PDB file of C-alpha atoms in Angstrom:
ATOM      1  CA  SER A   1     -99.587 -35.931 -29.578  1.00 59.16           C
ATOM      2  CA  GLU A   2     -97.341 -34.427 -32.250  1.00 58.52           C
ATOM      3  CA  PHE A   3     -98.201 -35.293 -35.875  1.00 57.37           C
ATOM      4  CA  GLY A   4    -101.310 -37.113 -34.671  1.00 58.73           C
ATOM      5  CA  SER A   5    -104.647 -37.633 -36.404  1.00 56.60           C
ATOM      6  CA  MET A   6    -107.956 -35.949 -35.562  1.00 55.21           C
ATOM      7  CA  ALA A   7    -111.236 -34.829 -37.150  1.00 55.55           C
ATOM      8  CA  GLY A   8    -113.188 -31.580 -36.975  1.00 52.92           C
ATOM      9  CA  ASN A   9    -113.000 -29.491 -40.139  1.00 55.14           C
ATOM     10  CA  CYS A  10    -115.708 -26.831 -40.484  1.00 57.16           C
ATOM     11  CA  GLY A  11    -116.159 -23.223 -41.583  1.00 57.31           C
ATOM     12  CA  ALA A  12    -118.322 -20.688 -43.413  1.00 56.82           C
ATOM     13  CA  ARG A  13    -117.982 -18.310 -46.370  1.00 52.47           C
ATOM     14  CA  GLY A  14    -120.356 -16.415 -48.657  1.00 51.02           C
ATOM     15  CA  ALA A  15    -121.369 -13.186 -50.399  1.00 53.11           C
ATOM     16  CA  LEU A  16    -122.376 -11.660 -47.070  1.00 51.43           C
ATOM     17  CA  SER A  17    -119.763 -11.309 -44.344  1.00 51.67           C
ATOM     18  CA  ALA A  18    -120.860 -13.299 -41.284  1.00 49.82           C
ATOM     19  CA  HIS A  19    -117.460 -12.765 -39.682  1.00 50.42           C
ATOM     20  CA  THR A  20    -117.778  -8.969 -39.508  1.00 51.35           C
ATOM     21  CA  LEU A  21    -116.335  -7.685 -36.198  1.00 51.30           C
ATOM     22  CA  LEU A  22    -113.731  -5.181 -34.920  1.00 49.08           C
ATOM     23  CA  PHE A  23    -111.115  -7.711 -33.693  1.00 49.27           C
ATOM     24  CA  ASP A  24    -112.094 -10.445 -36.136  1.00 47.72           C
ATOM     25  CA  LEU A  25    -112.614  -8.437 -39.338  1.00 46.45           C
ATOM     26  CA  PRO A  26    -114.888  -9.869 -42.147  1.00 48.10           C
ATOM     27  CA  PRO A  27    -114.111 -13.149 -44.060  1.00 46.95           C
ATOM     28  CA  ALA A  28    -111.624 -11.147 -46.135  1.00 44.80           C
ATOM     29  CA  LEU A  29    -108.905 -12.203 -43.678  1.00 47.17           C
ATOM     30  CA  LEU A  30    -109.824 -14.869 -41.074  1.00 46.09           C
ATOM     31  CA  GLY A  31    -112.841 -16.334 -42.893  1.00 46.45           C
ATOM     32  CA  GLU A  32    -111.229 -16.773 -46.319  1.00 44.07           C
ATOM     33  CA  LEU A  33    -107.693 -17.594 -45.148  1.00 42.67           C
ATOM     34  CA  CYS A  34    -108.818 -20.263 -42.658  1.00 42.56           C
ATOM     35  CA  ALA A  35    -111.334 -21.827 -45.080  1.00 43.01           C
ATOM     36  CA  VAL A  36    -109.707 -21.546 -48.530  1.00 42.20           C
ATOM     37  CA  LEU A  37    -106.148 -22.300 -47.372  1.00 43.04           C
ATOM     38  CA  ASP A  38    -107.507 -25.238 -45.353  1.00 44.68           C
ATOM     39  CA  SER A  39    -107.982 -27.172 -48.600  1.00 42.33           C
ATOM     40  CA  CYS A  40    -104.434 -26.195 -49.611  1.00 41.94           C
ATOM     41  CA  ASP A  41    -102.120 -28.979 -50.750  1.00 42.43           C
ATOM     42  CA  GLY A  42     -98.863 -27.095 -51.215  1.00 43.75           C
ATOM     43  CA  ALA A  43    -100.322 -24.757 -53.857  1.00 44.65           C
ATOM     44  CA  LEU A  44    -100.400 -21.829 -51.421  1.00 46.91           C
ATOM     45  CA  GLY A  45     -98.875 -23.513 -48.395  1.00 47.40           C
ATOM     46  CA  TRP A  46    -100.901 -23.602 -45.158  1.00 48.08           C
ATOM     47  CA  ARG A  47     -97.824 -22.389 -43.251  1.00 50.60           C
ATOM     48  CA  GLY A  48     -96.921 -20.054 -46.116  1.00 47.59           C
ATOM     49  CA  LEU A  49     -98.392 -16.995 -44.414  1.00 46.82           C
ATOM     50  CA  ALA A  50     -97.283 -18.030 -40.894  1.00 51.33           C
ATOM     51  CA  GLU A  51     -93.783 -18.938 -42.074  1.00 50.88           C
ATOM     52  CA  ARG A  52     -93.225 -15.441 -43.484  1.00 49.55           C
ATOM     53  CA  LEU A  53     -94.202 -13.767 -40.204  1.00 51.77           C
ATOM     54  CA  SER A  54     -92.056 -16.227 -38.188  1.00 52.95           C
ATOM     55  CA  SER A  55     -93.861 -15.643 -34.876  1.00 52.69           C
ATOM     56  CA  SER A  56     -92.225 -18.721 -33.318  1.00 45.32           C
ATOM     57  CA  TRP A  57     -89.866 -21.534 -34.358  1.00 43.65           C
ATOM     58  CA  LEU A  58     -92.060 -24.143 -32.644  1.00 42.08           C
ATOM     59  CA  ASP A  59     -95.172 -22.714 -34.334  1.00 40.00           C
ATOM     60  CA  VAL A  60     -94.810 -25.142 -37.260  1.00 38.29           C
ATOM     61  CA  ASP A  61     -95.289 -28.092 -34.872  1.00 38.29           C
ATOM     62  CA  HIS A  62     -98.813 -26.964 -33.988  1.00 39.36           C
ATOM     63  CA  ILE A  63     -99.476 -25.989 -37.635  1.00 37.53           C
ATOM     64  CA  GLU A  64     -99.731 -29.664 -38.587  1.00 35.62           C
ATOM     65  CA  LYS A  65    -102.018 -30.309 -35.585  1.00 40.42           C
ATOM     66  CA  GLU A  66    -104.927 -27.911 -36.400  1.00 39.68           C
ATOM     67  CA  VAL A  67    -104.650 -28.281 -40.206  1.00 40.78           C
ATOM     68  CA  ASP A  68    -107.403 -30.936 -39.950  1.00 39.78           C
ATOM     69  CA  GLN A  69    -109.315 -28.735 -37.485  1.00 41.15           C
ATOM     70  CA  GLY A  70    -110.003 -25.863 -39.877  1.00 37.84           C
ATOM     71  CA  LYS A  71    -106.390 -24.711 -40.564  1.00 36.89           C
ATOM     72  CA  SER A  72    -103.429 -23.979 -38.318  1.00 37.04           C
ATOM     73  CA  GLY A  73    -101.010 -22.250 -40.653  1.00 34.96           C
ATOM     74  CA  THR A  74    -102.871 -18.975 -40.930  1.00 35.18           C
ATOM     75  CA  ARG A  75    -105.651 -19.700 -38.404  1.00 33.58           C
ATOM     76  CA  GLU A  76    -103.279 -20.390 -35.500  1.00 36.15           C
ATOM     77  CA  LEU A  77    -101.225 -17.312 -36.363  1.00 37.05           C
ATOM     78  CA  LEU A  78    -104.310 -15.071 -36.322  1.00 37.27           C
ATOM     79  CA  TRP A  79    -105.770 -16.911 -33.293  1.00 35.18           C
ATOM     80  CA  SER A  80    -102.485 -16.438 -31.367  1.00 34.11           C
ATOM     81  CA  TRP A  81    -103.641 -13.172 -29.764  1.00 32.38           C
ATOM     82  CA  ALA A  82    -107.435 -12.951 -29.428  1.00 30.71           C
ATOM     83  CA  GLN A  83    -109.340 -14.039 -32.523  1.00 31.54           C
ATOM     84  CA  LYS A  84    -107.369 -12.422 -35.334  1.00 33.73           C
ATOM     85  CA  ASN A  85    -106.001  -9.163 -33.831  1.00 37.22           C
ATOM     86  CA  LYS A  86    -104.797  -8.223 -37.310  1.00 36.77           C
ATOM     87  CA  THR A  87    -105.848  -6.040 -40.211  1.00 37.75           C
ATOM     88  CA  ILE A  88    -106.474  -6.790 -43.883  1.00 36.75           C
ATOM     89  CA  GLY A  89    -103.668  -4.418 -44.887  1.00 34.82           C
ATOM     90  CA  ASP A  90    -101.144  -6.217 -42.655  1.00 34.54           C
ATOM     91  CA  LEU A  91    -101.887  -9.664 -44.124  1.00 35.57           C
ATOM     92  CA  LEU A  92    -102.302  -8.214 -47.635  1.00 37.79           C
ATOM     93  CA  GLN A  93     -98.555  -7.560 -47.811  1.00 38.54           C
ATOM     94  CA  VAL A  94     -97.875 -11.186 -46.851  1.00 38.45           C
ATOM     95  CA  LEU A  95    -100.577 -12.423 -49.261  1.00 40.01           C
ATOM     96  CA  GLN A  96     -98.920 -10.530 -52.118  1.00 36.88           C
ATOM     97  CA  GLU A  97     -95.546 -12.152 -51.368  1.00 38.87           C
ATOM     98  CA  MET A  98     -97.039 -15.661 -51.422  1.00 39.66           C
ATOM     99  CA  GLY A  99     -99.228 -14.920 -54.433  1.00 39.36           C
ATOM    100  CA  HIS A 100    -102.626 -15.875 -53.018  1.00 40.93           C
ATOM    101  CA  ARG A 101    -104.913 -14.975 -55.933  1.00 42.91           C
ATOM    102  CA  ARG A 102    -108.092 -16.251 -54.234  1.00 44.51           C
ATOM    103  CA  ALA A 103    -107.271 -14.270 -51.089  1.00 47.56           C
ATOM    104  CA  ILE A 104    -107.015 -11.094 -53.176  1.00 50.84           C
ATOM    105  CA  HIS A 105    -110.490 -11.795 -54.569  1.00 51.67           C
ATOM    106  CA  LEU A 106    -112.076 -12.053 -51.098  1.00 48.36           C
ATOM    107  CA  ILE A 107    -109.881  -9.317 -49.547  1.00 49.76           C
ATOM    108  CA  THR A 108    -112.150  -6.829 -51.355  1.00 44.88           C
ATOM    109  CA  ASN A 109    -114.936  -7.797 -48.912  1.00 47.68           C
ATOM    110  CA  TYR A 110    -113.254  -5.683 -46.208  1.00 48.17           C
ATOM    111  CA  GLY A 111    -113.902  -2.447 -48.091  1.00 50.26           C
ATOM    112  CA  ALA A 112    -111.946   0.730 -48.802  1.00 48.17           C
ATOM    113  CA  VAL A 113    -114.347   3.092 -47.026  1.00 48.94           C
ATOM    114  CA  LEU A 114    -115.577   3.426 -43.406  1.00 48.06           C
ATOM    115  CA  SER A 115    -112.981   0.855 -42.335  1.00 49.32           C
ATOM    116  CA  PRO A 116    -111.834   0.521 -38.671  1.00 49.97           C
ATOM    117  CA  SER A 117    -108.336   1.874 -39.330  1.00 50.69           C
ATOM    118  CA  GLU A 118    -106.423   4.820 -37.866  1.00 50.00           C
ATOM    119  CA  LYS A 119    -103.413   6.774 -39.166  1.00 51.08           C
ATOM    120  CA  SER A 120    -101.738   6.667 -35.727  1.00 51.21           C
ATOM    121  CA  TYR A 121     -99.597   9.702 -36.619  1.00 48.21           C
ATOM    122  CA  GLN A 122    -100.627  11.782 -33.606  1.00 49.47           C
ATOM    123  CA  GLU A 123     -98.660  12.362 -30.402  1.00 47.61           C
ATOM    124  CA  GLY A 124     -99.751  13.682 -27.020  1.00 46.56           C
TER     125      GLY A 124
END
């Protein structure tokens, strides 16, 4: 089933964030990265974000598989835990390395105020 062919590419993106949730933060991360990078043809590299993280050596095998199913490079990486289980700041560092200009544009949808982030500098 490796390097096979299949159909099922769909997604959503817009001015309003329909992907707003605690685990699966707004389209700034999952929505934009899975949709915009899906149409990627080496310009940004579907596996470009996943490759940098290097979660697994065999990850690239499945990357080719879901690329036609709405992205596997970034989508599979985010979908590895629950839905995304990541934060905009975490992927922002990776995005900067790759140079994803479009991602930067949509990353502003997350917001810089009232965000679900904690300092985590407390002990008890």
